[PDB]
Design a binder for this molecule. Structure first.
Ligand SMILES: *[C@@H]1O[C@H](CO)[C@@H](O[C@@H]2O[C@H](CO)[C@@H](O[C@@H]3O[C@H](CO)[C@@H](O)[C@H](O)[C@@H]3O)[C@H](O)[C@H]2NC(C)=O)[C@H](O)[C@H]1NC(C)=O
Ligand SMILES: *[C@@H]1O[C@H](CO)[C@@H](O[C@@H]2O[C@H](CO)[C@@H](O[C@@H]3O[C@H](CO)[C@@H](O)[C@H](O)[C@@H]3O)[C@H](O)[C@H]2NC(C)=O)[C@H](O)[C@H]1NC(C)=O
Ligand SMILES: *[C@@H]1O[C@H](CO)[C@@H](O[C@@H]2O[C@H](CO)[C@@H](O[C@@H]3O[C@H](CO)[C@@H](O)[C@H](O)[C@@H]3O)[C@H](O)[C@H]2NC(C)=O)[C@H](O)[C@H]1NC(C)=O
Ligand SMILES: *[C@@H]1O[C@H](CO)[C@@H](O[C@@H]2O[C@H](CO)[C@@H](O[C@@H]3O[C@H](CO)[C@@H](O)[C@H](O)[C@@H]3O)[C@H](O)[C@H]2NC(C)=O)[C@H](O)[C@H]1NC(C)=O
Lengths: 438, 52, 438
């Protein structure tokens, strides 16, 4: 027996589906979304880590000269100075007083610990939603892991379940992402090969193990002081270390709809948005023939107490007459009020009790016990606690019924005004007819 | 058929071979007006008629 | 000196750009797309391969009864038969005449060579382009590997190049893809867990190493014949073997725009569509001061022969008077004609020759040698050869110049008719003014 339904994408909300096969007693399922996971698709752009400047020892040439040689090193620098007269602890070598040269050399390289502490720059697109759902009906429990898209069928106790694609296409990750350890940032990073010194991305590597490196950190050599051997240089500080203290915010403390961001792999979990269509296919063994189900007649519904609070703040009483005692299925056919339980024990005593949660001043909904029906109306008083630490258990519907107190007053007033207008129109029509018949 | 875009064909185990056509025709451009229409008719034999 | 241009995405097309700095002599670059590669982004769905049926030896219980036991195996089938009287070569065991029992058992499992011969079912989306462009100018000549999207800057001889995103967003892979060895198929495969017996996807596995297996092949057991021990069964043949014989076509022999499909990784190459914006940033050492380059005056362009064929079938001549001999950079400012060379040696003899390829009956383009200008117009005759094996070297523009023979005839006829109409207007105006003056 094929069936279809639409369930909210809110974690912990006890959705109940009611299945009415004509030849069998009604069945009620319970589906709960234990956990979700919004998984984006990522493409690595480059990897940034702190740099490390290498300064080889100077080559002081005595009584001669040396020439600069070019090399293919990241941000390489080389120069030759003239007229150096260095000194050491024992004395001053380079016997010639003035005709000496010193060759200064330096270049950049990726740090030693870059494999353990680096920031990755990604591109994120086309998220994929994966969920973990708990399905319980009849006497079968169990929790399954289902991809939420229209092409993954999972069977729970002989019933085939297909969870349709999510209603909305909203993702909290922008197009460009920077990931660092366990934090995700919505950032726009420079293109590969065009990073600026002193900010994020001064040195870039295509991958952690990739040999190529692009470095642009304004390394500049200077002339050594007289009578000294030191190779002076200047360089704009690391852009990664600057980024660390001025990155600003995150996405973990910034994401909408209250969903926590995690890493490895990047994913956004328990993120309440949209609806999840569900398709089913149940065997014949799930239902019970209508002859075995108890016969219920003369169903009347009364409400003892009501309070439109988050928890189940209503008590419901049903009176009936039965021939045998057994099990019925209880469901509420409007989303203004949600029943706590899905089955009840019908007895010859003729009285059962139920709990429901509502969020409107005056609810009106129809409840069915096995095959019977009854219309319930009640007046609910507001709660007293200002703040509670648990989520709402109702569907958040506020508009009262047309038979409520406020709507009764509106109906009475509008009826009076309509009666006055009708009397006016009748008088005018009578006068016009008398005038025209003259 | 080998349009001006050309085409490729794969025969047995041999490598695919590509062949392209040229804007060749039968009329005479830079001639009498009854020959220029002929030239632009071998090329595009559906819009020359409409334009004329 | 920042510059920007748009160059066609056609392999082998010799694009030449004219950079005309106000203070320096003009420059001509040459860019060429040696190779292109379109990379989709893939998400593996499952793996399929030929199945293998495992049939354990029957358990014949002499003088007794046996009971079937359920197991968690893919497509497990077990049945118990009564009244069996097996036989063997030397005699028939199970002395009891009819109180015997045979238990038949069978189940299916992934084949032995499924790790070598299997088909992957992917989902392909969001292609990324990548090219290999050869850039040559002056004394620079190099080939670079570039990502064609507006975020990869590559330095060629001191010049920065950024190749913008492709103009169009056309990709040849549908949403769903089935890959086998070196062939890509545009196919719609059944969802995981809902494969049907006898067709593609009768057995599905989430990954080649994954322990779970979904199998659905309709394996059914049958009662053994009297006096034999054989465990009969019937099963619907493999779906991977039906698919191999009835997959039909491919994508390697079906893709539009003449682009080859290759596998490992999945990629479509040399696939001519769209335009590639290019951004540049040249140093000041590429140009030459206008004082040093020759001065060209009195430039006349005369066309020797023209034949609007695919190769360079037109010969051009330029006459000039120059003070000193050096180098110029020739260029054609209209895409009707495409020259072959981007540099010519000027001499005091005052005569240089150039080759161009055009595809219109009467072209008209303005050519420039260093700083001079000239307008060239010629009459071209069609080529005789019906089919040639090399691609067109022109931009394939056909509309002739307004000075061509055909358009001269149109202009003359329209002018005669317009003169007639203007004369008639004048006659009517004179007549009506005379009539109104009375
Ligand atoms: C031992 O110490 C003496 C101290 O002078 C060194 O003699 C010096 O040798 C250099 C190299 O041959 C000379 O430089 C040359 O200078 C001329 C100009 O006069 C120039 O044309 C050459 O190209 C070269 O640069 C230097 O002049 C000379 N000293 C003097 C005072 O002339 C000698 O090299 C030392 N030997 C060792 C093994 O260290
Ligand atoms: C289907 O299975 C789940 C998980 O096995 C059942 O939920 C479990 O319900 C029992 C009570 O029926 C929980 O045990 C008690 O939980 C309270 C919570 O405050 C705790 O204080 C007690 O010490 C005791 O552990 C159990 O924790 C709970 N498990 C989970 C994961 O929530 C569910 O009831 C089953 N369905 C049916 C119809 O029973
Ligand atoms: C040697 O051969 C004799 C053949 O008579 C075997 O005797 C058989 O023993 C089995 C023991 O399970 C008897 O089966 C039982 O039969 C009763 C009545 O049908 C049934 O209610 C029990 O549930 C059980 O199936 C079988 O009847 C009996 N054959 C007779 C009495 O003719 C003996 O077991 C053999 N010894 C071996 C193989 O070691
Ligand atoms: C700019 O540099 C590239 C290479 O970086 C030059 O490519 C050269 O292209 C020519 C033909 O286009 C190649 O010559 C060919 O050699 C093969 C060898 O078997 C021969 O069979 C052909 O007939 C032809 O002679 C040449 O190898 C290649 N140079 C390389 C790969 O280093 C290009 O020509 C340069 N630009 C200019 C204007 O020269």
């Amino acid at each position: 027996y094929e069936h279809s339904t639409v369930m909210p994408n809110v974690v912990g909300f006890p959705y109940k589906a009611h299945i009415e096969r004509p030849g069998y007693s009604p069945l009620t399922l319970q589906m709960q979304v234990v956990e979700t996971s919004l998984e984006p698709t990522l493409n690595l752009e480059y990897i940034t880590c702190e740099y490390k400047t290498v300064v080889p020892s100077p080559y002081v040439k005595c009584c001669g000269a040396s020439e600069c040689s070019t090399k293919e090193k990241p941000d390489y620098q080389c120069k030759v100075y003239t007229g150096v007269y260095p000194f050491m602890w024992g004395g001053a070598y380079c016997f010639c007083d003035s005709e000496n040269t010193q060759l200064s050399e330096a270049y950049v390289d990726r740090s030693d610990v870059c494999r353990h502490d680096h920031a990755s720059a990604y591109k994120a697109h086309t998220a994929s939603l994966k969920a973990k759902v708990r399905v319980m009906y009849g006497n079968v429990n169990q929790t399954v892991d289902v991809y939420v898209n229209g092409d993954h069928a999972v069977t729970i106790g002989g019933t085939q379940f297909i969870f349709g694609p999510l209603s909305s296409a909203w993702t909290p990750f922008d197009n460009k992402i920077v990931v660092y350890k366990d934090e995700v940032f919505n950032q726009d990073f420079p293109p590969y090969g065009s990073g600026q010194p002193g900010r994020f991305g001064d040195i870039q590597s295509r991958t952690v193990e990739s040999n190529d490196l692009y470095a642009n950190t304004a390394l500049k050599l200077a002339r050594p002081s007289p009578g000294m051997v030191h190779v002076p240089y200047t360089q704009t500080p690391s852009g990664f270390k600057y980024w660390l203290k001025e990155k600003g915010t995150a996405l973990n403390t910034k994401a909408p709809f209250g969903c926590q961001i995690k890493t490895n792999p990047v994913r956004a979990m328990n993120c309440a948005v949209g609806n999840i269509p569900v398709s089913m296919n149940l065997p014949d063994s799930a239902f019970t023939r209508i002859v075995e189900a108890p016969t219920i007649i003369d169903l009347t519904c009364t409400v003892a107490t009501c309070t439109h609070s988050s928890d189940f703040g209503g008590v419901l009483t049903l009176t009936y007459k039965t021939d045998k005692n057994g099990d019925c299925s209880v469901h509420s056919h409007s989303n203004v009020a949600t029943l706590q339980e899905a089955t009840a024990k019908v007895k010859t005593a003729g009285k059962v009790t139920l709990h429901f949660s509502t969020a409107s001043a005056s609810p009106s909904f129809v409840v069915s016990l096995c095959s019977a029906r009854a219309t319930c109306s009640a007046s609910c008083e507001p709660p007293k606690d200002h703040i509670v630490p648990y989520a709402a258990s109702h569907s958040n519907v506020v508009f009262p019924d047309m038979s409520g107190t406020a709507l009764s007053w509106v109906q009475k007033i509008s009826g009076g005004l309509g009666a006055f207008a009708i009397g006016a129109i009748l008088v005018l029509v009578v006068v016009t007819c008398i005038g025209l018949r003259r | 058929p080998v349009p001006v875009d050309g085409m490729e064909y794969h025969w047995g185990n041999n490598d695919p071979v590509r062949l392209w056509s040229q804007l060749t025709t039968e009329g005479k451009p830079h001639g009498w007006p009854h020959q220029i229409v002929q030239y632009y008719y071998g090329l595009y034999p559906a819009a020359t008629v409409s334009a004329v």
